[PDB]
């Protein structure tokens, strides 16, 4: 059976004087001190919770078996999607179990690879490459490393011919690319201001993002300033250069929304080519009404992807010399989301459509916009189309729940109809034919039909006897695709599991209407959709309440935490990874202020009223005190986080853990809460980008805990 050994919950101090007023409503915050990650009391908290977590995980006798089977199932070589610059080709490679992927160069696609940068030689591959950019002549490689424990990036540059490093060093980058000019003299990039003397990446909320240009062979202090806006500190940036080299495009965003400005700088009409300097941008779009991504241009005639009067998106054309005259090229599909578009083979387009959460590729003529070929893809995901307009061969990656990884090739000149296999990964000692994945539509609370994928062994009896894992996200217009996971295969084969992915509202799967039906005032719909999916898996006979585990990350951690507060009776195991748990204060820390488009903000009264109803730390309640449900407790709960997660600050997880342990366990002398409530806190790690063995260790602990919580035996 499950957990029997008694639990020594550690003491956690409460400061009872901390109370905040939100428009007349008082809210106590007695774990306010856990907001400081560098204090002695917080470091002691982490030590005590590690100790508790270790004694619980010692009781989970299947961790070692999961660990070895994950290692075995992921031990296959993985070739990344290749891209071209000049007459060289470039790709990422991993021989199967390397700590981080290696970046390689070739003369032709079937030639000997040469290693350009191997992260495994630095600090055991604790961190990998988060930025990688090759110049137009293929002579230089700009690469982004992690100098500290946070996700902040330092940019270095090397010569491809001998791998010698230049001395250039650029600090203060997060998500920016490095965008080379066709003269090969430098690149655009978009940094934040420097840290001042006292400051720390874990406690500073960075603002005032900049657009800069760096000349090769200079100090970062000489980089040219192109754009800043001190009167709108929260406005953030992305950028791009056109395939012909003529135009630098700056996109300006506000919050999480899919709505951006478009500023264009004509590089061919500068008197002193960027040393002249804000710059004289043509402001094509100067408001936050719609999304705009440049796909191609011939001179000043541009082709954009846009959601303007088009919730499922479309392609449109406009001349910069006549800026107010926009014309449709490929109209909005009546059914399906246009996810992305790419110019190829000089005068053609590849369009990626999402049709009931499956991809469909269309080949089209660029000038006229007419359909040429249509290729439906199997259940899974196509992504990573990086080919540029000058290339006649297009590459992309395919993954699915039961398909580890294929790199496909579409030669547009020689045979544009079908797809050929360039590379194909294989899972060792795994018979794919014994399992199946199906889509079903389940009615939510309000009647809306929610698509879900269900993966399972073929021919099982729907008798309620199977352990079930359900995954979801539901936010920011993100499309949740059934991709490959090695640990999920171990769950299916060796624990007899049923896996479910729920395409709940708040994602982008049916366009902008799907996103808006699960954000701001309608965030509760997201939780209702997830709860309804779990109720369907029970009523149809896949599983029962004791045997359901739910998991999710970040906005998906919020999902898990809210669902266990509202319907603890439905679940046997809950795993929240790096979740947003204090919805009253999230906007104050690091770049959390960028989530106010989706969540709203407690600075405003009507938005506070949404947030207080579901904020995880403000809604923990003893389920046994509600008349009728005296035999209900919280499921076995694992809260996961990392000590230098600057994306989602670990105070979110720390404060929830303390509130749960207090309300349910330590505030009562003889609690009915038997199931364990623990945290697994990864030391010296950030949100993402961890070494292979470090991530395997986290995942094996999660699944061992799950198996114990659900009372699921191992199957050889």
């Amino acid at each position: 059976s499950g957990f029997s050994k008694p639990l020594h919950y550690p003491p956690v101090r409460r400061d009872e004087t901390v109370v905040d007023d939100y428009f007349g409503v008082k809210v106590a915050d007695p774990y306010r001190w856990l907001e400081d990650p560098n204090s002695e009391e917080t470091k002691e908290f982490v030590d005590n919770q590690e100790k508790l977590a270790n004694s619980v995980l010692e009781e989970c006798e299947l961790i070692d078996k999961f660990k070895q089977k994950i290692i075995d199932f992921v031990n296959f070589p993985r070739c990344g999607v290749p891209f071209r610059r000049a007459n060289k080709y470039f790709h990422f490679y991993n021989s199967g179990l390397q700590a981080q992927n290696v970046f390689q160069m070739q003369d032709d696609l079937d030639g000997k690879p040469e290693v350009l940068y191997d992260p495994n030689l630095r600090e055991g591959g604790r961190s990998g490459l988060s930025l990688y950019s090759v110049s137009e002549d293929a002579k230089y490689f700009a690469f982004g490393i992690h100098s500290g424990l946070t996700e902040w990036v330092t940019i270095k540059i090397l010569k491809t011919e001998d791998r010698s490093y230049l001395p250039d060093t650029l600090e203060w980058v997060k998500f920016s690319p490095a965008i080379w000019t066709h003269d090969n003299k430098g690149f655009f990039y978009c940094p934040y201001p420097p840290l001042k003397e006292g400051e720390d990446h874990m406690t500073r909320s960075a603002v005032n993002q900049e657009a800069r240009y760096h000349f090769l062979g200079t100090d970062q202090s000489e980089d040219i300033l192109l754009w800043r806006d001190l009167e709108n500190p929260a406005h953030h940036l992305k950028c791009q250069i056109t395939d012909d080299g003529k135009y630098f495009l700056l996109y300006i965003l506000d919050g999480c929304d899919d709505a951006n400005k478009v500023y264009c700088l004509d590089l061919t009409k500068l008197p002193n080519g960027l040393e002249s300097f804000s710059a004289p941008f043509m402001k094509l779009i100067d408001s936050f009404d719609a999304s705009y991504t440049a796909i191609a241009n011939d001179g000043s005639v541009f082709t954009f992807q846009t959601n303007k009067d088009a919730p499922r998106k479309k392609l449109v054309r406009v001349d910069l010399n006549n800026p107010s005259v926009w014309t449709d090229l490929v109209p909005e599909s009546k059914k399906d989301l246009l996810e992305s578009a790419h110019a190829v083979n000089e005068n053609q387009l590849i369009l990626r459509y999402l049709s009931d959460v499956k991809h469909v590729l269309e080949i089209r003529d660029l000038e006229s916009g007419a359909l040429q070929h249509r290729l439906p893809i199997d259940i899974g995901s196509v992504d990573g189309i990086t080919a540029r307009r000058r290339d006649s061969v297009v590459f992309f990656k395919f993954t699915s729940i039961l398909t580890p990884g294929i790199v496909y090739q579409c030669d547009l000149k020689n045979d544009p109809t079908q797809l050929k296999i360039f590379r194909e990964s294989v899972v060792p000692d795994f018979d794919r034919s014994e399992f199946e994945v199906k889509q079903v539509f389940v009615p939510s609370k309000d009647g809306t039909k929610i698509p879900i994928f269900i993966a399972a062994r073929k021919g099982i009896s729907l008798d309620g006897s199977h352990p079930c894992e359900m995954h979801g996200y539901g936010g920011f217009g993100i499309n949740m695709m059934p991709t490959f996971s090695a640990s999920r295969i171990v769950f299916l084969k060796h624990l007899g599991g049923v896996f479910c992915l729920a395409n709940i509202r708040g994602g982008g799967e049916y366009g902008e209407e799907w996103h808006k039906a699960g954000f701001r005032d309608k965030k509760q719909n997201v939780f209702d959709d997830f709860i309804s999916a779990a109720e369907y898996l029970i009523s149809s006979g896949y599983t029962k309440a004791r045997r359901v585990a739910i998991e999710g990350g970040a906005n998906g951690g919020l999902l898990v935490a809210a669902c266990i507060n509202q319907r603890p009776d439905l679940f046997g195991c809950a795993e929240a990874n790096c979740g947003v748990m204090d919805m009253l204060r999230f906007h104050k820390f690091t770049l959390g202020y960028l989530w106010t488009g989706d969540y709203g903000c407690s600075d405003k009264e009507e938005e506070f009223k949404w947030l207080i109803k579901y904020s995880p730390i403000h809604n923990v309640r003893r389920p046994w005190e509600q008349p009728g449900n005296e035999e209900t407790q919280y499921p076995a709960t694992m809260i996961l986080t990392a000590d230098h997660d600057d994306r989602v600050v670990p105070l979110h997880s720390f404060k929830l853990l303390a509130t749960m342990q207090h309300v349910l366990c330590t505030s009562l002398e003889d609690s009915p809460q038997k199931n364990p409530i623990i945290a697994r806190i990864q030391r010296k790690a950030a949100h993402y980008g961890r070494a292979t063995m470090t991530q395997i260790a986290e995942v094996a602990d999660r699944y061992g805990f799950m198996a114990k919580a659900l009372e699921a035996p191992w199957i050889d």
């Binding site: 994950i70 998500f175 999480c256 970040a554």
Partner: peptide, 13 residues
């Protein structure tokens, strides 16, 4: 890429 979301991952674990 700037959202409450975890996505050149070393392995599909």
């Amino acid at each position: 890429v700037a959202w409450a979301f975890q996505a050149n991952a070393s392995a599909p674990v």
